[PDB]
């Protein structure tokens, strides 16, 4: 029960998948604008 705390609290921090989802989308966007 000791360190059963923080890893789901790091799964809280998977908004970087969402913010960097927008950044990955944007990479595709302007990358293919360039292409």
């Amino acid at each position: 029960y000791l360190s059963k705390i923080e890893e789901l609290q790091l799964i809280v921090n998977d908004k970087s998948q969402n913010l960097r989802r927008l950044q990955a989308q944007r990479n595709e966007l302007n990358a293919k604008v360039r292409l």
Partner: protein, 159 residues
């Protein structure tokens, strides 16, 4: 490396396909095939054989029950060698993709990281020096030590 497929340039389109190859060799990935299928849909010829050779590197060690795109490419590479007016820089390594496609006849495989826990470094030497064989044709010949048997041998006495 799917994000690395976004590259503007054919050395990182092509080398990104190489990253699919030497990174995911013995894996049973279908998404790598899903990446390589537009990589042979590309007016650069040698990135299309980036898909030939790299997809031959995903089609090592594995059969049709592993992924359904095996026989598709087994017939598809002879299919694109039926097109005479392709580049023979495109079908440069097509027969090579058949040889990597049937290295052993799926009897042997790669050992980048052996099952023992430790890597198998002369296989790593063979794959890393293997790469840019346009620049030196015997770089193609250097893929000797990169293969280990996928077989079963019950030895108690050596004869």
């Amino acid at each position: 490396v799917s994000l690395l497929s976004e590259s503007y340039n054919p050395h990182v389109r092509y080398g990104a396909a190489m990253a699919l190859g030497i990174c995911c060799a013995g894996t049973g990935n279908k998404e790598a095939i899903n990446l390589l299928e537009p990589m042979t849909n590309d007016p650069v010829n040698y990135v299309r054989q980036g898909a030939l050779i790299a997809s031959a590197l995903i089609m090592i060690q594995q059969t049709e029950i592993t992924c359904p795109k095996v026989n598709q490419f087994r017939q598809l590479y002879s299919k694109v060698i039926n097109d005479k007016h392709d580049d023979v820089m495109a079908k440069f390594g097509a027969i090579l993709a058949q040889g990597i496609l049937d290295a052993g006849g799926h009897n042997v495989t790669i050992s980048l990281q052996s099952r023992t826990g430790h890597t198998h470094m002369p296989s790593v030497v063979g794959v890393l020096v293997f790469t840019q064989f346009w620049f030196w044709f015997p770089l193609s010949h250097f893929l000797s030590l990169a293969y280990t048997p996928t077989c079963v041998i019950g030895l108690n006495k050596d004869l």
